[PDB]
Amino acid sequence: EWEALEKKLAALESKXQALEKKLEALEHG
Amino acid sequence: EWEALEKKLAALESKXQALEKKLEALEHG
Amino acid sequence: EWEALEKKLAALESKXQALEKKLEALEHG
Ligand SMILES: [Cl-]
Ligand SMILES: [Zn+2]
Ligand SMILES: [Zn+2]
Ligand SMILES: [Zn+2]
Ligand SMILES: [Zn+2]
Secondary structure: OOOHHHHHHHHHHHHHHHHHHHHHHHHHO | OOOHHHHHHHHHHHHHHHHHHHHHHHOOO | OOHHHHHHHHHHHHHHHHHHHHHHHHOOO
């Protein structure tokens, strides 16, 4: 249970950072 | 408390995916 | 530590709200 949550959490953090860069690129272009 | 962490993670995973869907629709649309 | 997970989830939720806010301002720009 713990491991399943932490792994899902790390993946969501990586996605979060990627979407922040994507939104900035969308605004900036 | 653990159930609340699971529920928060699931709701944020869905929020995360919904935002990704709009960003991908707009950047290739 | 469960507080470490709580903190990471809170930071992701704040990032999620910040990106949604900026995307909404962009789309309505
Ligand atoms: Cl706590
Ligand atoms: Zn794309
Ligand atoms: Zn709107
Ligand atoms: Zn829209
Ligand atoms: Zn409007």
